[PDB]
Amino acid sequence: DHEAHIKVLRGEPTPEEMAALMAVLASAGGGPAEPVKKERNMWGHPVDKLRYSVFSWQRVTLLERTHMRR
Amino acid sequence: HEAHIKVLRGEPTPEEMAALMAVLASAGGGPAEPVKKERNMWGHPVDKLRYSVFSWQRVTLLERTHMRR
C-alpha cells in the first residue's frame, strides 16, 4: 500500500465526529478539476497570428513545436 | 581577350566587308538595354503551395526562394 491518506494528526474523535468531519470534507472536496474531455482545438491559436521572418528560428522552436506537441 | 568574328574562306573587298558587317550589325536585334530586371516576389508560386508544418521544403524551397538574391 502506497496511497497518501488523510491524517488526523491531533485529537481522538468519536465515530460520529469522524463521520461529521468526513461528510463535511467530502462535500467540500473539489469537483472534476482538470476535466476528462479537454479536447484539442488549435483553430486560431495565437502562434499562428504572429509575423515570422522567413528565416526565423521560432518557425522551428515555437510554431512547429506548438503545432506538433501532443 | 575578346572573341572576335572570323572569316574563314576567301577575302572580301572593303565594300563586301562593309556590307557583311553592316547587315550583321542590323541583325543584332535585342532589348537595347540588357540589365538585371526589377525583383517583385508578389504572389510568387512558392507562396501558394501547402507545406506541412514540419516540411523540410519550408527551408529548401520556400525560404531559399525568398532569400536568394
From TrEMBL, chain A:
- In the record, what terms sit under GO molecular function? acetyl-CoA carboxylase activity; propionyl-CoA carboxylase activity
- Protein name, UniProt field: Acetyl-/propionyl-coenzyme A carboxylase AccE5
Source species: Mycolicibacterium smegmatis (strain ATCC 700084 / mc(2)155)
Name the lineage: Bacteria, Bacillati, Actinomycetota, Actinomycetes, Mycobacteriales
State which stretch of the full-length protein is shown.
Answer: 25 to 94 of 94
